[PDB]
Ligand binder design. Structure first.
Ligand code: NI
Lengths: 128, 8
């Protein structure tokens, strides 16, 4: 718990400087100390996304979701994990899948950023 | 330019 979060935060610091190796490693240590926290897994998903590895990001988002449905109290992080899957489709121009996943996210927790990203995709899709 | 995915 305590050290887990100090591991996550060093990872966070690394990720923000695009030091993805270091982020992943600190995220791993965080996950070994507290396997039931889906945030570390969604954090790794973010790393793979910024690497261009959209597929791994989605895989990791899916795992984060199974861990969170077990917690049962984590609707907002579940929401984040779906919107990250949406984002990863959006990046590949797979807009129908992007939109579907934003709707999943919003249904969990409505947020403005995710609503705005959804409307962007709906407009692109409309006008195609 | 490009927005970065946010870490928690
Ligand atoms: Ni579906």
């Amino acid at each position: 718990g305590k050290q887990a979060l100090k591991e996550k935060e060093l990872g966070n610091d690394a990720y923000k400087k695009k030091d993805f190796d270091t982020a992943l490693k600190h995220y791993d240590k965080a996950k070994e100390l507290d396997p039931t926290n889906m945030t570390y897994i969604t954090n790794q998903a973010a790393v793979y996304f910024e690497k261009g590895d959209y597929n791994k990001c989605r895989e990791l988002c899916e795992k984060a979701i199974e861990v969170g449905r077990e917690n049962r109290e984590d609707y907002r992080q579940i929401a984040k994990a779906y919107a990250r899957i949406g984002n990863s489709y959006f990046k590949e121009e797979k807009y129908k899948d992007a939109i579907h996943f934003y709707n999943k996210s919003l249904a969990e927790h409505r947020t403005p950023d995710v609503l705005k990203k959804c409307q962007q995709a709906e407009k692109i899709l409309k006008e195609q | 330019g490009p927005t970065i995915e946010e870490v928690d």
